[PDB]
Amino acid sequence: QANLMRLKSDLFNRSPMYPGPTKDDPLTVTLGFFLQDIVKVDSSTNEVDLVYYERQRWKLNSLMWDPNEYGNITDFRTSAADIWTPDITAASSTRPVQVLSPQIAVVTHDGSVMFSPAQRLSFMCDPTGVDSEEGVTCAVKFESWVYSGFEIDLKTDTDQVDLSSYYASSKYEILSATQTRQVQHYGEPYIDVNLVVKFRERRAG
Amino acid sequence: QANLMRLKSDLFNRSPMYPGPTKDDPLTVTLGFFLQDIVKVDSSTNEVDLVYYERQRWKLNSLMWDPNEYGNITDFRTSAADIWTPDITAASSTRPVQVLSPQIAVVTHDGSVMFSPAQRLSFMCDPTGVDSEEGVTCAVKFESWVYSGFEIDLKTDTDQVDLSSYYASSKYEILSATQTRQVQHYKGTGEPYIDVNLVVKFRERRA
Amino acid sequence: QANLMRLKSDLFNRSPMYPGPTKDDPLTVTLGFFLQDIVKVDSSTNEVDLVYYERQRWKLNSLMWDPNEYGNITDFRTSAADIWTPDITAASSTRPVQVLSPQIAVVTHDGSVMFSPAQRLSFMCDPTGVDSEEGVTCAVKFESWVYSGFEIDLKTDTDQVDLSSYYASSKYEILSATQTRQVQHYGEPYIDVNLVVKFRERR
Amino acid sequence: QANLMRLKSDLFNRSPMYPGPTKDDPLTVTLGFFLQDIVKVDSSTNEVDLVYYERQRWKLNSLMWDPNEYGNITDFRTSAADIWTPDITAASSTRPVQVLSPQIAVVTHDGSVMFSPAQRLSFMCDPTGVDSEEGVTCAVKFESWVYSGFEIDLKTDTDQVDLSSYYASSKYEILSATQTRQVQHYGEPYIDVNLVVKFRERRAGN
Amino acid sequence: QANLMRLKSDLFNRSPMYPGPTKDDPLTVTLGFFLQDIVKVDSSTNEVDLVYYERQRWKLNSLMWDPNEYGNITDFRTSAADIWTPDITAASSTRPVQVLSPQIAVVTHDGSVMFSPAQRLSFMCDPTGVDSEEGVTCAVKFESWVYSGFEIDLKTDTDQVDLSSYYASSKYEILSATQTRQVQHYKGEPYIDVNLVVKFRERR
Ligand SMILES: *[C@@H]1O[C@H](CO)[C@@H](O[C@@H]2O[C@H](CO)[C@@H](O[C@@H]3O[C@H](CO)[C@@H](O)[C@H](O)[C@H]3NC(C)=O)[C@H](O)[C@H]2NC(C)=O)[C@H](O)[C@H]1NC(C)=O
Ligand SMILES: C[N+]1(C)CCc2cc3c(cc2[C@H]1[C@@H]1OC(=O)c2c1ccc1c2OCO1)OCO3
Ligand SMILES: C[N+]1(C)CCc2cc3c(cc2[C@H]1[C@@H]1OC(=O)c2c1ccc1c2OCO1)OCO3
Ligand SMILES: C[N+]1(C)CCc2cc3c(cc2[C@H]1[C@@H]1OC(=O)c2c1ccc1c2OCO1)OCO3
Ligand SMILES: C[N+]1(C)CCc2cc3c(cc2[C@H]1[C@@H]1OC(=O)c2c1ccc1c2OCO1)OCO3
Ligand SMILES: C[N+]1(C)CCc2cc3c(cc2[C@H]1[C@@H]1OC(=O)c2c1ccc1c2OCO1)OCO3
Ligand SMILES: *[C@@H]1O[C@H](CO)[C@@H](O)[C@H](O)[C@H]1NC(C)=O
Ligand SMILES: *[C@@H]1O[C@H](CO)[C@@H](O)[C@H](O)[C@H]1NC(C)=O
Ligand SMILES: [Cl-]
Ligand SMILES: [Cl-]
Ligand SMILES: [Cl-]
Ligand SMILES: [Cl-]
Ligand SMILES: [Cl-]
């Protein structure tokens, strides 16, 4: 307890909070999606509701420490309010994202941060053809709302969405789910991760 | 990092926040709408739901700096809570506006601020005739709720609503969408009031 | 900007906030309703939903200033959190009121305050007969939740509800709409403004 | 204004807030319900929605003053955040209580506090038989969530729910409505107020 | 009153708040569920709604005191905001949990804390077969979202969910309800959950 309180005091009370990236000090944020359930489909509004968690990883020099100066603490947990977090936004949401997990992040001695918010998201998707073998494909882009590619670069470690927590008795079967980095233009480049999900009705009973 | 922290400290910790415009120091706010989806229509209540983002631009002397004194930083991002933002309100909404984007703004060295809130809005609209070739026209005015034309002037850079992010598989097809400044008066008052009239003509998507 | 920051600093940072009226220093609050839409009717629950704004006016000595000492500023806008506001409540609501406008008020050099919250309100109303020529009448009382008539007096400037922003393609046509002060008893007297609205389905 | 600001300063800024009752300094909290409407019934989930206000009364030495030292002020209004309030909870709610009134209380010179929150409550109730002459009976217990009978003694002044603000054109007619203290044992006593409401669908002719 | 104000001042104003457990100072949190109602079932979305309260118990050295130094006060009540609370999360919820009780905890002189939040939870559950004698079984795991088994250990005092406040006129009858500690791994570090398993049917 004593060493951790010291470590947190040294990192957070002394310095101001990290103000975010700039053109000369850009930040790479790595995203991975863990899809849990397609909960609902609305064919009259073309809205589909997903439950997932979203692993976010980035690294800052100002959060580094030597474990030896702090009782060999290699990492700790702290409220996401205590640190800067990236402003990752679904571009085609139709309702505010509903938060399903505590807003708490893991900080490691090398300055790495891991934050895994669980979310329910309504987004624009035409479900026509969902009761077929071919199913239906829908997509939603995740991006920083305010930072260009020169400030925040997004990437994934893998192109495959993790389906290992996908609810086995969901009304919808996942045929494929990918997560792919894209470069958009508008004067200046912006980056997104395109979440593409192909699915169909699983018929039961 | 070091230079940006200094710049933010110099602008925000020293001064109080901008208290808003007055009759002798008015503010011009420029609006542009980027329509993403007509999500639903309710013909039993005459409510229609829009998803859009709304680019807002204004300029303040107290947010100016010289890039040379701060490592050639020309702009930065910061929480909208750190600065004054205009109170732009839909005049004929039927539900509170739902916020769909982070409350973060871009501040430029000349004192310009750009803030682009994404929103879902329910507003008053009779959709009768939406299932026809002519479609239906609906309108909603955006205005400062509390400031007259002598304190906040609203304008647009273009009369055409940007449809470039409009959802291609929406249930509703956009036939036209305009955004037009209007000057209103009222018989007793000694002041004009300004709005931006968003006018959208649309129909159910055909086969 | 500089003068306004000074004025706000002088009024708000120096003094504590106005603590509200007392028996020896009562406050008159003037109310006026501007009805925009009857949005829906629920005949299975006897709830009706109204969209309106509500102009509220009162006056306090502690908010006065001389324009000459502050660059001829005659009035300003500020967050409703920065000042005392009256706690005007619908007596027969069935859901929390939904706020449709920024919580910002206008303060004038004489100490006058004007606050105009736009609201969506669900309230108790039997709509039976709404599909007829005579239509249906419903009423809702607005009152301070906590202050008696000896602390807050409510009144209206006019008996007639302003219908000038009423939505022309509403499903419901307004036949009449009045706003009238009432005195209630239970020992101490309490004041309300009774909003009475007669309406029908548009023909 | 000047005297009231002084009085509030003397009561709130000097002392810490009242930390709540203990076994050696118990508090009596009196409840009364004022039922306004049974708004809806859901026979597929056995949930019923009530609108009411709930008058809460208690008394604290630390909120006493002499009116003569403060311009003959006998009472004032203040935000419920400025004072301790009891944690009275419906035991069988199915949704968070929806607040319909400002969170403001009335404090009197003798240290009495009156707080009257208006609420919409969804609670567990089987409405089967509501469309009959006998109607249906449903009940919900109100209790302090954390305090025993040795810390908060909870009571009513009357066993009859006040129906004087009940909406005359409600879909549901109130046949009876009571509010009755129940004192339980298990060594320490635990208290609730049982709100029991018998009602039926309003009859045109029957 | 005077002694309690002193005690709270000494515990909360002097020290910083407990920062949470670490690998070298782990915390055991004991959970018990008190099921009140299965309120609804949605067979078109496979969501089921439960109302329950959840007794949570843990112990911290920094919240200890000697009753003799504080007028023989053995325990007190305080806002949950005044102390650290564990971030116990339903792993398969579909909506934010709705809070049905005041956020207030009981702290005892030995440093024990008891916190009993009442909740309405929507979670993933296929109700197909609920209208039968056998009924249907559904499960939801409760876990710390952020702490491994080396920081937070979860357990139960009993394997049986308390049904003593279960609503007698619910649309759904409880056939069985268990609460069981589980140890999970992934392809390195172990994480702990309490599996709430409920078998139920439509009331006949
Ligand atoms: C708010 O309104 C006030 C009147 O409506 C303005 O007051 C005026 O300010 C002027 C500028 O300082 C004064 O001018 C001066 O006049 C006197 C003789 O009256 C001369 O001796 C001075 O030389 C002359 N100024 C100069 C620079 O030579 C006016 O006298 C004065 N009028 C009044 C009080 O009635 C305020 O300036 C105005 N505030 C603003 C615009 O911020
Ligand atoms: C479309 N988005 C992702 C959000 C809204 C928006 C609205 C805009 C804009 C860019 C953007 C972008 C996004 O937001 C930015 O502020 C931004 C964006 C992308 C790339 C950028 C940006 O600033 C410099 O380079 O330029 C003028 O109006
Ligand atoms: C609807 N708004 C934008 C706000 C509230 C309001 C309240 C009113 C009114 C018009 C308005 C308008 C608008 O906003 C004003 O603040 C305002 C408005 C119009 C005309 C005015 C105003 O103040 C003095 O004369 O007429 C009488 O009471
Ligand atoms: C009905 N209202 C408006 C709200 C709730 C309420 C509940 C009550 C009561 C008065 C009131 C009034 C209103 O609220 C007050 O607190 C109050 C009210 C009116 C007059 C008063 C009051 O306190 C002293 O004099 O007396 C007993 O139970
Ligand atoms: C339902 N209430 C009133 C509140 C919460 C609660 C939570 C519980 C419990 C009983 C209760 C009761 C009430 O609150 C208590 O703390 C309590 C209660 C009743 C009986 C008790 C208690 O502690 C020892 O014996 O048993 C296990 O977890
Ligand atoms: C699935 N959860 C509950 C949340 C997200 C997550 C994301 C992960 C992970 C584990 C977890 C777990 C849980 O959250 C943690 O932070 C965590 C978790 C389990 C085990 C752990 C953990 O940190 C060290 O050992 O390992 C790599 O990326
Ligand atoms: C921390 O690591 C060192 C290096 O091996 C180890 O010997 C020591 O036991 C650890 N810390 C403390 C406080 O003993
Ligand atoms: C506290 O405990 C002691 C030990 O029995 C007792 O004799 C004493 O009277 C108590 N004092 C107070 C202030 O409660
Ligand atoms: Cl940081
Ligand atoms: Cl500003
Ligand atoms: Cl004030
Ligand atoms: Cl108190
Ligand atoms: Cl703690």
From TrEMBL, chain A:
Family matches, as InterPro entries: Neur_chan_lig-bd (IPR006202), Neur_chan_lig-bd_sf (IPR036734), Neur_channel (IPR006201)
A molecular function GO annotation: extracellular ligand-gated monoatomic ion channel activity
Record-listed Mg(2+) 3 binding positions: 75
Disulfide pairings: 125-138
Keywords: Calcium, Metal-binding, Receptor, Signal
Superkingdom of the organism of origin: Eukaryota
GO cellular component: membrane
Neurotransmitter-gated ion-channel ligand-binding domain mapped to chain residues: 16-200
Residues holding Mg(2+) 5: 151
Residues involved in Mg(2+) 6 binding: 185
Entry annotated with the keyword Metal-binding: yes
Coiled coil start-end: none
Keyword Ligase: no
Residues that, per the record, bind Ca(2+): 164
Residues holding Mg(2+) 2: 75, 151
Pfam families recorded: Neur_chan_LBD
Binding site for Mg(2+) 4: 148, 151
SUPFAM superfamilies: Nicotinic receptor ligand binding domain-like
Known glycosylation sites: 72
Protein name: Soluble acetylcholine receptor
Species whose genome carries this gene: Aplysia californica
Automatic annotation (TrEMBL), chain B:
Binding site for Mg(2+) 3: 75
InterPro entries per UniProt: Neur_chan_lig-bd, Neur_chan_lig-bd_sf, Neur_channel
Keywords assigned by UniProt, alphabetized: Calcium, Metal-binding, Receptor, Signal
The name this protein goes by in its record: Soluble acetylcholine receptor
Glycosylation sites: 72
Annotated S-S bridges: 125-138
Annotated positions binding Ca(2+): 164
Record: residues binding Mg(2+) 2: 75, 151
Binding site for Mg(2+) 6: 185
Domain Neurotransmitter-gated ion-channel ligand-binding: 16-203
Domain of life of the native organism: Eukaryota
GO molecular function, a single term: identical protein binding
Lineage, highest ranks first: Eukaryota, Metazoa, Spiralia, Lophotrochozoa, Mollusca
Automatic annotation (TrEMBL), chain E:
Superkingdom in the source lineage: Eukaryota
InterPro entries named in the record: Neur_chan_lig-bd, Neur_chan_lig-bd_sf, Neur_channel
Annotated positions binding Mg(2+) 2: 75, 151
Annotated residues for binding of Mg(2+) 4: 148, 151
Domain Neurotransmitter-gated ion-channel ligand-binding, residue spans: 16-201
One GO cellular component, as annotated: membrane
Sites carrying sugar chains: 72
Listed name of the protein: Soluble acetylcholine receptor
Species: Aplysia californica
Name of the coding gene: LOC100533247
